[PDB]
């Protein structure tokens, strides 16, 4: 069995701090990753992912236990759990930085994966991912400068 230690602390704390109603999920969710069922213990956290019980434990999810097994599953599922978390959390330029981060990690693993010149998959994920990022990163933009370069209008750099 892959239980472990670690994660027995984890699940503990997880349904010490998570709302009962995410109870019989999480349930499914201990003996998922206990059988090592990566895509199960997916789906279940896919099925938190719809809910809003307790979204902020999607954090400690992302970064002490999905951080065991992220590159065995969808990409865009393990970034998902990071970006309702961190984009609930009371800052955004954190949230810039960690989901490029998480998508340099997957950038990384491109070539593990397995890879050809375009080949089917070549990093779509990670091109949404930067695409959402890009995304915050214009939401947050520091000035909309003027109509003066009214076709894209930033201001969060320049020059240097």
Do not use: C
Request: glycine share 2%; proline share 2%; aromatic share 12%.
């Amino acid at each position: 069995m892959f239980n472990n230690h670690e994660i027995d602390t984890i699940l503990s704390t997880l349904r010490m701090e998570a709302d009962p109603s995410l109870h019989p999920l999480f349930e499914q969710f201990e003996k998922f990753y206990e059988e090592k069922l990566w895509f199960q213990l997916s789906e279940s956290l896919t099925k938190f992912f719809d809910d809003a019980k307790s979204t902020p434990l999607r954090l400690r999810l992302y970064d002490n236990f999905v951080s065991k097994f992220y590159d065995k599953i969808n990409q865009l599922s393990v970034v998902k759990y990071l970006l309702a978390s961190l984009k609930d959390s009371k800052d955004f330029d954190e949230s810039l930085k960690y989901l490029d981060d998480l998508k340099a990690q997957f950038q990384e693993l491109d070539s593990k994966k397995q890879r050809n010149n375009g080949s089917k998959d070549h990093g779509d994920g990670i091109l949404l991912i930067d695409s959402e990022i890009a995304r915050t990163y214009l939401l947050k933009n520091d000035l909309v400068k003027a109509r003066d370069l009214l076709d894209d209008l930033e201001k969060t750099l320049d020059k240097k």
